[PDB]
Write a protein that binds this ligand. Sequence first.
Ligand SMILES: O=C(O)CN(CCN(CC(=O)O)Cc1cccc(O)c1O)Cc1ccccc1O
Ligand SMILES: [Fe+3]
Length: 498
Amino acid sequence: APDEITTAWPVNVGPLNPHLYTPNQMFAQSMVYEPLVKYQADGSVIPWLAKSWTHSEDGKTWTFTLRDDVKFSNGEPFDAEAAAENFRAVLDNRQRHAWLELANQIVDVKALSKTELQITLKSAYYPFLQELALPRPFRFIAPSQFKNHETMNGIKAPIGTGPWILQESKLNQYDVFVRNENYWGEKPAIKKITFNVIPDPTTRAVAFETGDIDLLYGNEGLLPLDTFARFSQNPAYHTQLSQPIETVMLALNTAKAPTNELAVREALNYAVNKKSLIDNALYGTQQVADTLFAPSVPYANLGLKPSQYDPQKAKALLEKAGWTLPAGKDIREKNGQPLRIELSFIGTDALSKSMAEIIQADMRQIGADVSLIGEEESSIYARQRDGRFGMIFHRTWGAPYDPHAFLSSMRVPSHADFQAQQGLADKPLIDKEIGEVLATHDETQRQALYRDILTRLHDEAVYLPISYISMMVVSKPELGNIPYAPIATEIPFEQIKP
Ligand SMILES: O=C(O)CN(CCN(CC(=O)O)Cc1cccc(O)c1O)Cc1ccccc1O
Ligand SMILES: [Fe+3]
């Protein structure tokens, strides 16, 4: 049918518990569940399930006036009691939301009436509203669908207030969504969306070619980039490539030899020809990055100095630090130790592998021996949490997480960023400033704090920025132009209009 589309995803959508993480897929959570306030491209929020709000002070106390016409898809009312119950369900699982600072900040949530919801905070936390706009955890399921008055141990039916309803879900096969005919807002033009489960990139491309699917929408791993370029020239298809949404980079372990040495980290930051990496591995479809956050990111236009590809300077830095070439060898040594660094990545990911081979080659030219460790997903995530790496592939989180939520999470010990930064003498100071910047109201101090944090991270060469990557689209021409959502992980199916 013509108001029915078929697309694909590498895995199923999950149970669609609005308050939990893996294996729930964010974009699908955002299809079913809705926030109090909705994020926009300009960086503000607009009213959503909450039609208005006031704050005290000195903002520790916020009072939201909720809409009074909203129903969950099962007929039950959305009201302040329903909302307060959801905040309780999430904060009963507080430990698991450590990465998100609002979760440590909420002191209390209570329904003052049916339409009045009061939320009090530990301090005047500036990104309050943006964090409420996230896909998860602060979105609302029907409280009748809690299991014994909680969500952290599972839910019953995934009943949201959103424009889409999960119809059917078959493990390792497909997920089917259907339009909410009783939605409080704008009715979407599409009536039915089918997600076929296709874990392999080339298989996804083939499925589009044979006509089995109408739409692919994702990041740089969506399909092979050479196939994408070919598709963009094929008059029978439609393709798109957005403006960059986030950064892809290596994180270097400042706590582990030999990346513990500033001079070594600086040298590595001159070793990679990033344009060539991009033209070679990413088929020219992405942009070079010479900084943890692109100059376009809020608070991140700082005139930071790039380290341009310069093997001559890389070698000089290494020689000066005492990493010199022994007789007939190509690998530097210092104290008898070789300049050896492990680069760990997901071994099944062909793009990572490609990029890692290029990185390994470039670094060999300046006399560093990069050893490639490709392992399964769990092993890699286990490495990121324990600091068991020399270098790893990492990325930022895009809007609305960048830069505040990304820096926030640098303070959490079981994250890759904390671990990479562990060896820095000024790490306690940086973590303290991250805490300050999030609670500050003085705009000039806020800017000064971001500058100091990002500058120290740049100068200490914690990262090796690689590119700023884009969203991509392949579609049947009949679907028309495919819009992008403000939040990088969401897919605006509601806005597709054949
Ligand atoms: O990704 C992390 O470091 C931790 N996550 C917190 C930060 N997440 C936002 C989010 O997940 O809501 C940032 C995030 C941002 C964009 C895309 C993502 O896939 C993504 O995860 C939570 C998490 C826990 C357990 C398994 C997977 C997870 O993502
Ligand atoms: Fe996450």
